[PDB]
């Protein structure tokens, strides 16, 4: 989900509460900020959003 503030969240069924998106990507071994940005595309506005 994307909240009204522009911050992304992930809702895992077991986890009682949503997690921030970058935390979830880093838990999966994708730690680089550059790589995290690259994994979702290259459109500059999207890059600025992330």
């Amino acid at each position: 989900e994307r909240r009204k503030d522009g911050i992304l969240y992930v809702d895992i069924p077991n986890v009682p509460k949503p997690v921030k998106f970058v935390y979830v990507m880093r838990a999966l071994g994708l730690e680089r900020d550059k790589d995290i940005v690259e994994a979702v595309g290259n459109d500059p506005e999207v890059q600025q959003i992330m």
Partner: protein, 388 residues
């Protein structure tokens, strides 16, 4: 027979009749006398017939008016349409119709789904389209989006050039310098390099796309001229004068706008009417709303049932929902309330308060096994025993 004689005879014989009945009788008797030369005997016979008919038409004690009114309201609704329409008119404002509207009025929701105000005009501005448009501008609640012919939201280089149409500007009565002056007087922390027929904005050197997007949308829908919470206005011409229909709900503010006739002005939101004009006005507005909603669907319902419902709703100064939230939920009969709840604390509260159940209802008497005090359950009989 001089008209004074007819009036005197009416007052002499039909003194029991209501005022409207005797007035209408006088009018039509005058017309028929001037057309057919009636004598006094016919007038006396006519008045006696009217009195007898009125006496026959009176309701008898013990009639269960409440159940009859409830049924006569509920039954037509089953034949009435069930929303799921989008009436797209040109000189009209979308308004919830039919069953949803009836439910909203009956449950007295705080804010209607489609608030709408009817604004009349004083004598000066009533008989001209241009003065009506002027009052509209006073009440238009004009927004930059409506003024703009089109908008270009180009975030790629941090600017926002919105194209303003001259015709909408002329209709609103505002000029580019005027609107820019108002905007800067409101948006102090901004720089407006207005050029030609385009507005140019900058968010005090913002950094991220989202910030400028939010700032641009903040300006786009920002109000320039007009009372709060008012959208489009459709000035029509009904009868002979021009009447200003309007969206939104600012019933107390609009009454102070010059050129607005406050006596005839009405609004959809009944709660606002209760706040501004009082509770009797709220009752009358409820009656009129239900009548109009029934009429637009072609159904016919007697005014008396709606009057009873409205009187029952506004029984204690404040308009309350007729359902279990405001009327049923406060039933005095603890037995009647008992078979509507999930807890037993109401029994303890009633016992503490020493509440007395008068058994004046229906459910409690039915549960006990006693005649309901309506209709034939009201009468008492006596007889003189010596019989032939």
């Amino acid at each position: 027979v001089s008209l004074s004689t007819i009036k005197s005879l009416i007052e002499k014989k039909g003194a029991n009749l209501p005022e409207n009945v005797k007035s209408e009788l006088y009018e039509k008797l005058k017309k028929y006398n001037e057309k057919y030369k009636l004598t006094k005997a016919e007038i006396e016979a006519i008045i006696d017939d009217v009195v007898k008919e009125y006496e026959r038409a009176l309701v008898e004690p013990g009639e269960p008016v409440g159940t009859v009114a409830a049924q006569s309201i509920g039954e037509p609704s089953t034949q009435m349409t069930l929303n799921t329409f989008h009436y797209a008119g040109v000189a009209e404002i979308n308004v919830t119709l039919g069953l949803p509207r009836i439910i909203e009025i009956v449950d007295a929701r705080k804010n209607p789904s489609t608030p709408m105000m009817t604004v009349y005009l004083d004598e000066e501005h009533r008989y001209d389209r241009a003065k009506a448009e002027e009052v509209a501008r006073r009440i238009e609640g004009t927004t930059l989006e409506n003024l703009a012919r089109s908008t270009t939201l180009d975030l790629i280089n941090f600017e926002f050039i919105v194209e303003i149409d001259p015709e909408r500007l002329e209709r609103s009565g505002l000029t580019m310098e005027k609107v820019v002056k108002k905007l800067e007087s409101s948006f102090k922390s901004a720089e407006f390099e207005v050029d030609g027929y385009t507005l140019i904005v900058r968010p005090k050197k913002a950094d991220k796309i989202s910030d400028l997007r939010r700032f641009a949308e903040k300006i786009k829908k920002h109000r320039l001229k007009g009372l709060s919470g008012v959208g489009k206005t459709i000035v029509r011409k009904e009868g002979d004068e021009y009447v200003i229909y309007t969206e939104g709900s600012n019933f107390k503010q609009v009454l102070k706008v010059p050129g607005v006739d406050p006596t005839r002005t009405r609004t959809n939101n009944i709660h606002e009417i209760a706040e501004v004009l009082g509770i009797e006005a709220a009752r009358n507005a409820i009656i009129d709303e239900i009548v109009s909603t029934m009429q637009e669907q072609g159904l016919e319902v007697d005014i008396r049932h709606i009057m009873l419902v409205a009187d029952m709703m506004t029984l204690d100064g404040i308009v309350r929902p007729i359902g279990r939230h405001g009327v049923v939920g406060e039933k005095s009969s603890v037995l009647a309330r008992a078979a509507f709840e999930i807890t037993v604390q109401h029994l303890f509260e009633a016992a503490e308060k020493g509440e007395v159940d008068n058994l004046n209802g229906v459910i409690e008497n039915v549960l006990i096994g006693q005649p309901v005090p309506v209709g034939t359950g009201m009468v008492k009989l006596t007889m003189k025993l010596p019989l032939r």
